[PDB]
């Protein structure tokens, strides 16, 4: 995705379905970010009982 970004920023402005897909990809990437957040939090909290 990163090499697609650095290569095709000039393409992604031009086609609006790419823009909508990047919007939904932003939401789902932030969803996985909060998944990373909760599994980071639960492992850190999990140190308390150990």
């Amino acid at each position: 995705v990163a090499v697609v970004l650095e290569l095709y920023g000039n393409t992604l402005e031009s086609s609006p379905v790419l823009q909508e897909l990047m919007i939904d990809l932003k939401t789902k990437v932030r969803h996985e970010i909060h998944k990373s957040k909760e599994a980071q939090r639960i492992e850190g909290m999990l140190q308390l009982l150990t």
Binding site: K37, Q40, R41, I42, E43, G44, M45, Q47, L48
Partner: protein, 123 residues
């Protein structure tokens, strides 16, 4: 208006960026971003943010955001002499926080872990 007069004052100023920082608007943060005076902003911005990784105000990091997103290409080739020494400094200045963001999210969990057991002591 608040930012244009400060831009003319920096066109002579870090207090000018702090004084146009009394606006706090992201649309103005994009509009004043295009209006090479953005390097004259960046010469105060890079120093102020390297001197402080923990500044809890928002318009200087969001201004670095709108500058590194709106001016993303040309900021590398203003100079390869004296901005890039500070650029090789700021990679060390920031990523120290990047190391502890997993740990700070860990203790962010470890706090509400005890908040919920204090609520369970309430009931």
């Amino acid at each position: 208006x608040x930012x244009x007069x400060x831009x003319x004052x920096x066109x002579x100023x870090x207090x000018x960026x702090x004084x146009x920082x009394x606006x706090x608007x992201x649309x103005x943060x994009x509009x004043x971003x295009x209006x090479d005076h953005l390097s004259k902003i960046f010469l105060t911005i890079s120093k102020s943010i390297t001197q402080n990784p923990w500044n809890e105000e928002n318009l200087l990091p969001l201004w670095l955001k709108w500058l590194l997103t709106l001016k993303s290409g040309e900021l590398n080739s203003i100079k390869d002499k004296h901005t890039k020494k500070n650029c090789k400094h700021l990679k060390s200045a920031l990523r120290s926080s990047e190391e502890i963001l997993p740990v700070l999210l860990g203790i962010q969990g470890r706090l509400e872990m005890l908040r919920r057991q204090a609520k369970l002591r309430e009931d």
